Amino acid sequence: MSAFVTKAEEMIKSHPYFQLSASWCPDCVYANSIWNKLNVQDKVFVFDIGSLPRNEQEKWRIAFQKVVGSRNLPTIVVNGKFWGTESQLHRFEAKGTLEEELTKIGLLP
C-alpha cells in the first residue's frame, strides 16, 4: 500500500508501545481492565478504534496486516512489532508469570 505502510512506520517510531483495541468489545474490556487497574496508562499508549465504520475498518485491517499481520482486535504491538495477543494475557495470568513478563519489557520498575 505504501500510503498506509509508510504512515504506520512513523506511528511506531515515536509510539512503539501502541495497542489496537476496540471501543466496546468483550476482549477490549479485558485489556483495558488490566491497564486501568494497574494504573499504567501513561508509560503505554492505547488507542480505541470503534467509531470508524466498516469502510475505515477495512483500511485499518489491511494496514495492520502489513505492519505485523493481525486482522483482529485487540492487539499489542511493542517496539514496532507484535509482542502480545489477547490470549497471551490470559495465558500468562493463568500461570502467574504476567507480572514478571511485564517487567522484562521494561514497563514496570
Burial 78-89 (b: 16+ CB within 10 A, else e): bebeebbebeeb
Q: Which residues pair with 21 in a beta bridge?
A: 48
Quote the CA–CA distance of 15 and 55 in Å, as a whole number. 25
The residues with which 48 forms a beta bridge, in sequence order, are 21
CB 72 within 8 A of CB 17: no
The superfamily (CATH) of domain 1-109 is Glutaredoxin (3.40.30.10)
3-state secondary structure of 32: helix
Q: Give the integer Cα–Cα distance in Å for 94 and 84.
A: 15
CB 35 within 8 A of CB 63: no
Distance CA 23, CA 19 (A): 12
Q: Where exactly are the structural domains of the chain?
A: 1-109
Q: Say if CB 22 and CB 28 are below 8 A apart.
A: yes
Helix or strand or coil: residue 102? Answer: helix
Spacing of C-alpha 15 from chain mean position: 11
Q: Which of 98, 100, 80 is nearest to 31 (CA)?
A: 98
Cα 30 to Cα 17: distance, rounded to the nearest angstrom: 18
15: left (phi over 0), alpha (psi -120 to 50) or beta: beta
Strands 75-78 and 81-84: antiparallel
Name the nearest CA neighbour of 19 among 3, 32, 5.
32
